[PDB]
Write a protein that binds this ligand. Structure first.
Ligand SMILES: [Mg+2]
Lengths: 225, 53, 48, 48, 225
């Protein structure tokens, strides 16, 4: 069977559809599923790893003038999407200094070089008059899900480790349709649907997934007795 | 009509027949009329004890 | 201490079905809908 | 669909949304081991 | 991250082999094992008997006078025939077998053809009695997977009986994933792949071909639109 045609349909930086057709019968699941597993587990991303709040010793506490407790704030920070524009960048510290009353969003972080916030409207905390929020959020780069109990990263004494979910891919689905080429009617049409948080485009995640699968296939070489 | 259990379970892999379909298989010199699932069960026991007879 | 769900913890619904977590699977191992949504919990029908 | 193979489960499955509770019985509070330790006064047997 | 895994091979003869790849990242035993098993069972090129002609025989369900086996049993024996084409250009052949009773016809009784090898020459075809005549024409083709007789329906002559084409040299595949550790990592995978073949291709050769097929398909995600 000849080389399938590859089609790409992307909506911004967060959704994309990738079509491969025609394929031999059964190759929709042969190609689609290994890619889905790699996309959902093994794509590097960035995540908040440690947060330091001035005048806060642990996460089981509240801040004067701030409506949320530290636990709620850290949950909000876990939804922060940070995109590194430099491939060699491994870590960053985002600084936020706010005085009440105001709605502190992710857009309130001080700008950093080669760092972009993908969800500026993320709500972080609500400050009442007389409340202040001075915090340093450390964002690292990695793969998988590393609980705070494992990395235990603290840039300083009172810093609070945060469970890290590094995967940029949000949802993966693939569709197998009944295509036909010539007189053969059992051919497959594979369509991969990839949802990302925006830091990595779906096309970038797909290329990284293909390279990971290609690299692993090279391990079936140099057999040993 | 399958020449042996391996051919019958190859057809099941390709979706030709189901495990619950009654077909003809040749197993241990006999032309049995059973389903691929029952032929699969026989192989399960044979391999666990490592004695086909 | 902030306790997360782990193997050996006990879960229950309001209808008397109770059990302990015996396996935590990665997201890519769970059964998923055709739209790509994985399920969160798998319950044995033999308990009904 | 099966997340490991990508093949569908051979029969339609009952999937839905259910309210499940995390009960007070946690394995963290119940795991206990002892080699040697305190003993009783009169019988000198291990405490419980 | 993890270092490159070790690939070990344990092959007994030309028909069974065991291949171990370890250590692997969590979940990669399934990611690699499932696609390879599917490719092994459906995509390895092979040869099979696709049509048989027996003199004086009308339909597959009849019985030849003077031979112990009936038409159904003879066709079943032919489906076990392992033949290898030594010429890549050769696409199809016809094996001729003229036999006289009371010999026990074997696969070796076929008239030799150029660049065609019978891998199992001791295969039993039929048993003839005094006065039994077996004039049989068997057509051997090239293909992959399993094709039922009613699907291809290949007939060379009138009264020819189409026969199910077992093209795949791989007889059975069974892969296994075990939990292993490397130091403080405890969620590693160990992949064991077991392959049964008919002997025309070694299990290692089939595994190498399956990896190449997956490798080739991964390159299809290369040129969008
Ligand atoms: Mg995130």
């Amino acid at each position: 069977l000849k080389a399938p045609v590859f089609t790409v349909r992307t909506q911004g930086r967060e959704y994309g559809e990738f079509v491969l057709e025609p394929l031999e019968r059964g190759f929709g699941v042969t190609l689609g599923n290994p890619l889905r597993r790699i996309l959902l587990s093994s794509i590097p991303g960035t995540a908040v790893t440690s947060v330091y709040i001035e005048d806060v010793l642990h996460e089981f506490s509240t801040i004067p003038g701030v409506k949320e407790d530290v636990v709620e704030i850290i949950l909000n920070l876990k939804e922060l999407v940070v995109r590194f524009l430099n491939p060699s960048l491994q870590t960053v510290t985002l600084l936020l200094k706010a005085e009440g009353p105001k709605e502190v969003k992710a857009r309130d972080f001080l700008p950093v070089a080669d760092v972009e916030i993908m969800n500026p409207d993320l709500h972080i905390a609500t400050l009442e008059e007389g409340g202040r929020l001075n915090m340093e959020v450390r964002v690292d780069r990695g793969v998988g899900y590393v609980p705070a109990e494992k990395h235990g990263i603290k840039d300083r004494i009172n810093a609070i480790p945060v469970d890290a979910v590094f995967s940029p891919v949000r949802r993966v689905a693939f569709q197998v349709e009944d295509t036909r080429l010539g007189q053969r009617t059992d051919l497959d049409k594979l369509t991969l649907r990839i949802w990302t948080d925006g830091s990595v485009t779906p096309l970038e995640a797909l290329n990284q997934a293909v390279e990971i699968l290609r690299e692993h296939l090279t391990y079936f070489s140099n057999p040993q007795a | 009509v399958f020449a042996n259990p391996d051919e019958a379970l190859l057809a099941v892999a390709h979706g030709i027949v189901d495990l619950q379909d009654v077909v003809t298989v040749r197993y241990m010199g006999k032309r049995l009329e059973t389903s691929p699932g029952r032929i699969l069960f026989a192989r399960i026991v044979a391999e666990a004890v490592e004695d086909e007879k | 201490q902030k306790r997360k769900l782990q193997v050996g913890d006990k879960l229950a619904n309001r209808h008397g079905n109770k059990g302990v977590v015996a396996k935590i699977l990665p997201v890519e191992d769970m059964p998923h809908l055709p739209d790509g949504t994985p399920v969160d919990v798998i319950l044995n029908p033999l308990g009904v | 669909y099966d997340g490991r193979t990508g093949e569908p489960i051979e029969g339609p499955i009952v999937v839905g949304q259910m309210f499940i509770m995390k009960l007070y019985h946690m394995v963290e509070d119940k795991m206990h081991a002892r080699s040697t330790g305190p003993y009783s006064l009169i019988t000198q047997q291990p405490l419980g």
